[PDB]
Design an enzyme around this catalytic site. Sequence first.
Site, PDB file in Angstrom:
ATOM      1  N   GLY A  39       0.819  -1.207   0.000  1.00 44.00           N
ATOM      2  CA  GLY A  39       0.000   0.000   0.000  1.00 44.00           C
ATOM      3  C   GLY A  39       0.849   1.251   0.000  1.00 44.00           C
ATOM      4  CG  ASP A  77     -10.544   4.065  -0.092  1.00 44.72           C
ATOM      5  OD1 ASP A  77     -10.659   4.460  -1.275  1.00 44.72           O
ATOM      6  OD2 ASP A  77      -9.463   3.642   0.397  1.00 44.72           O
ATOM      7  CG  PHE A 126       0.033   6.566   3.581  1.00 44.90           C
ATOM      8  CD1 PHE A 126      -0.942   6.914   2.648  1.00 44.90           C
ATOM      9  CD2 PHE A 126       1.031   7.491   3.888  1.00 44.90           C
ATOM     10  CE1 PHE A 126      -0.930   8.163   2.036  1.00 44.90           C
ATOM     11  CE2 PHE A 126       1.054   8.742   3.283  1.00 44.90           C
ATOM     12  CZ  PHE A 126       0.070   9.079   2.353  1.00 44.90           C
ATOM     13  N   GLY A 127       2.225   2.283   4.302  1.00 45.51           N
ATOM     14  CA  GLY A 127       2.445   0.977   4.913  1.00 45.51           C
ATOM     15  C   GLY A 127       2.325  -0.217   3.981  1.00 45.51           C
ATOM     16  CE  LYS A 128       7.465  -2.004   3.081  1.00 39.32           C
ATOM     17  NZ  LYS A 128       8.846  -2.060   2.500  1.00 39.32           N
TER      18      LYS A 128
END
Lengths: 292, 101
Positions: free
Chosen positions: A21, A135, A23-25
């Site tokens: 992603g 989202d 913002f972050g994995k």
Amino acid sequence: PLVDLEEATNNFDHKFLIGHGVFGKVYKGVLRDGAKVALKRRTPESSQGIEEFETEIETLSFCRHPHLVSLIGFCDERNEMILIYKYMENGNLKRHLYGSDLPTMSMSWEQRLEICIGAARGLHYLHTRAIIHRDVKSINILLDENFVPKITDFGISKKGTELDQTHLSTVVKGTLGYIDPEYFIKGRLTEKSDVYSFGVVLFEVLCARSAIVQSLPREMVNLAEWAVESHNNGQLEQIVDPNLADKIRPESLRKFGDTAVKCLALSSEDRPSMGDVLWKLEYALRLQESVI
Amino acid sequence: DNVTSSQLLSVRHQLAESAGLPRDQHEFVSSQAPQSLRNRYNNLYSHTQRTLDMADMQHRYMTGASGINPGMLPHENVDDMRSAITDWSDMREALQHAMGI
């Protein structure tokens, strides 16, 4: 939250696997108790990832639905912030719709509808709880070992006060193809903003044009616009889908397309509630059986 | 992998600065347009606009300047516009070639 502490703490060193992603994995892992688990490590790029991390905690403390990704635990320890969920074997809906790889061919129409209904059920519940997702997309719909759909990712979701009737007003958030245009042009947010977003997912399921916003073809760039151009007036197009063959009963195809068209109404005023969207989808699955 | 917004913006400007065939080449695209196949220019131009816009969108989202997630990862934009740079330096080759006739 009825019970309070579900704070798991620092597992192992990272086994490089699964999704990524902005913002972050996200990594797959097995826990001390053998549970296959999904770690959303949000340490890459702390550009107010803090806010979304906390949002996905309180929103997801209403952890009690078959069609909402269940949060197992969280972190916020030694600079880290990781959220923890059950591992969804089959990944996301997009993956099963003209993404890439893994054979045994495509999904069936029933299976596709069963998913859409499940996703609706989840979103409808969120609206019961005055939570607006914001989202909604094919990427954000996960499915398990039994292909039970689960709504994931709530870092952008918003809670209302009046419960159901909320027509609130804030900054514009979402994904390019799925943004409610009324929410974009005006700044007004409504639970029906998820309906437009879901409306795209519907056509995404149908056409397998899981690319949605596609910067290659003609004036047919926007899927929520090219599909409306048909099952609204231009054609009621049976030509828009991939190789779903002669497998959809025409009456259910009209019903599915009609619902998906109604979701994409320009003004939120004319769009159906996820509640009705739900009934319509169940009825379109139903519309696959009886004699003259 | 793991691409930064500063890294991204750097690749963005790199494309924008290189999206420009020299004078004497463009002089003979609106005067001696080699065939019809060489719309490859005007098709690439518009595509480069699409690339640059999506890149600009991507940036604002990463920076926190906007809350519209463009739909693809940051590394997908660099891979798109690093690709677009080759497309230009091929146009500049293709034109130099076709016009030297």
